[model samples]
Target: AQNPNCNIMIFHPTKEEFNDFDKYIAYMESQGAHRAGLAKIIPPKEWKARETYDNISEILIATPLQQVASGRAGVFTQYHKKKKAMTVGEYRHLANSKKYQTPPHQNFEDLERKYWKNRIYNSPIYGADISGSLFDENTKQWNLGHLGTIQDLLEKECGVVIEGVNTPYLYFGMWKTTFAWHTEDMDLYSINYLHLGEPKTWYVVPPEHGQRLERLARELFPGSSRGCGAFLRHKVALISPTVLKENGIPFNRITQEAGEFMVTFPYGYHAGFNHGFNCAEAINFATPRWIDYGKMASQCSCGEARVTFSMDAFVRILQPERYDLWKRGQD
Candidate 1:
């Protein structure tokens, strides 16, 4: 369905449409609404969020504690920016801590039935995006999925598919944990699948204002207003949807339920938080359609400055995919 503004939409995949995932992928591959949309992947009953949370953690039970990124989980935490990885036990303890819980709003409860939330961002559960990986001694082997129909077969033939820089990161988020406003580096596509738990609240920013948002984040002088109400300056800004709405920036919010798949397009700045403790699996992928984007992003100077890196490793791989895209530009 069209959004309130018809600029972005949250689509409910029909049972028949989802019967074959490839058919639906073909549909989304072409759309007038080219921004972000949350597509439901499974019914509530069959795909369990709590079970998924446990299973994902079980896969990493034996990971050496030293490898995890620590401190607050999300990069945009309110405090304690230093990084360290949280083990499964560490994460469980943090989730139970009152300090990690975001305060209640209006008539909401100070605490939910479940424990307060925290996250283990950028943590690898059942993966390193490499061939030989493990979750634990007992959980030795995983059916770590293939890129499958998502890959550009044409590009794969040209030797561009050697390495997948898109790390398979598992996010276990509590109420307040959030991924800040940002886009995938080099205009690549990001696919986020919510295994289970409370629905996450996602606000998707259109790509049209991407450069404007970048300007707002970097160009604004300290103490400078720039007429962007409450949207101040930071090396890497966390611009709330409320502030963006206040300043007349167009975006859409979706409450993504469990068993849902959310695909964010290239350069779409999105941020979200878990309504409660939830688990999500995310990975990035590329297509020939993204070639020019990767090209431009790779051509940048000293750095992207406080945000995603635009290096040749991610961008250069898209070269071969362009010929097929050029052949089928109409599609």
Candidate 2:
């Protein structure tokens, strides 16, 4: 089916004759008084005391709410300064050191228990070796090896044919802050499943509504200080069984099962926070065959970015056929 038009399926909260705000502070307090996971509202003291990127990283590992509460923290810094500019040995040392520790507070055993609990609850159809600490930068992009296995399972179990083999794998690992939001690229299908204990809340928006929400958010919130928090964002196209339907682009609701809600981009926008009582960890997969605008910008100017090129290359080597289809846009 052809993709849907822009306006058919957008949604958002409506303001009645003009609504107001700030008083929600009380309501928020009653709702647990914690920061908004998607908005990245940190305590004044914590915000002022941010000493180094590593210090901020410590907080995210220690607190689940902080995972998505803060905006993009040093995303560019690590991309351009640490990974791109630094030598391989320097990068490895830094990633291996305590400076990049995962789950900064809990021991290895606690993390394992949480990981398995979520895995079983989520019912991942395909399994990858998600073992090892994600904080260790070396292991972060290593799972591309498993993409082949995952693809095999998809075909055998669901009879779904994946288009690309050499497609790239992109990943973004962050230390916690709030209000940071991002979208996936347009030419791929993506699936993200939580691995660790972090509680996440997601909202799916139609593409046509994305720009409007962004503009409204900027007008109302203003400044770089306000962002969409730790929510995962992606480019999506509107799709429905019947092209003539006037209703809107349809989206699958949040399914606890793994691999159930595979998403195609340029039509939909998914955003949310990692603020559950449990700690947070997740696995996000996408075909890196084509570079989207966000990635293109990141690649040329950003330098040694972990989420874009490196993982993509790894996936390519692991699945050449899938990679080719993704690059060709035949998938």
Candidate 3:
């Protein structure tokens, strides 16, 4: 079936709107843009931040080779367990290597086997926290460390650091390398900025369809869901958008270009792949409105392996009145 148009909301925020981070996100939140699960923000063209490029040429990194299964089903990581360590310069060279390219009429199985044998299509370089040293404080508007308004409330009020949540993570991506379907940790909001390189493709299921997607995923990948309720967090499954559409779950497509920011709403399931080599930074955050969602995530019955987060501690600081009532089961 032909999927719906890639109609996720796109914002061309002026320097003023982009700089006033909280007010702008609040405005988007008020408009219910989060209903779609994702939105793309294109910054004012001329705005230049201090550090635009990461000097990874000589830096050695480990990459898990990924594969595109039969019939363009999905890109996967854990299915084949192997990782190769190489310099960023070497990886970039391998990504563009003509030796790995396939002819349009080549047999799928042969090419798939060839890729596996040669360790082609490396998985995304994710969760590299550079929050402390990546960028200067002046870039507060898009700085994952200090994206303002309610986003800073968690760290500013609680004095705790949640790596990969509150801390910014640098990601390096190559063509078709995927981030499997999952919600932000603790079901909080997430913002991703593609600092450079090719446009990335995003697939998102709106908030209302979040449960349906999870149920369908569990049904499809029972092994992964066997014990863990937060199975998607495993990051092993990669359900294609076609499956979602076939199952009658609403999903939208988004193409995020360089200099663009993608914000994901609470409990919104999102997944995507890179069009080509790209570097992006992302982090999970919380606005005042995210408290209830955090509480709900904490109360999940599925028994996640790790404690999600402390909503009680957050409530103590965020809503003192509700904290007592919440503990007493009154509110």
List the global CA lDDT of all models.
0.47, 0.28, 0.64
Q: Count the backbone clashes (under 3 Å) in each candidate.
A: 7, 44, 0
For each candidate in turn, the TM-score is 0.63, 0.31, 0.74
Candidate 3 lDDT, 193-248, residue by residue in tens: 88777667888988767888888888887766776666786555677655676788
In model 2, the runs with Cα more than 4 Å from the true position are 1-145, 148-179, 185-189, 195-199, 225-267, 278-331
lDDT score, candidate 3: 0.64
> Taking the tens digit of each residue's C-alpha lDDT, what string does model 2 give over 84-159?
2322233224434453323444743444334323321221111111222233333222222233333443345446
lDDT of 2 at 278: 21
Best model per TM-score: 3
Worst 10 residues of 1 by lDDT: 125-134
Return the number of clashes found in candidate 2. Answer: 44
Model 2: lDDT to the true structure: 0.28
Clash pairs, model 1 backbone: 49-196, 68-85, 69-84, 69-85, 70-84, 70-85, 117-174
Compared with the true structure, the alpha-carbon lDDT of candidate 1 equals: 0.47
Sort all candidates by lDDT, best to worst.
3, 1, 2
Candidate 1 C-alpha lDDT tens digits along 1-331: 3333436544566544544444555576565345443333343233222322344453443332212333332222222243345455565555556755444554222222121232344322221122222123232111113343223432554455443333456666655555556666556667676665656777776766666655555443233334332232122334555456556666777667676667777667777656555666676655555555555542222222222232333433554443243223212
Deviation in Å, model 3, residue 178 alpha carbon: 0.8
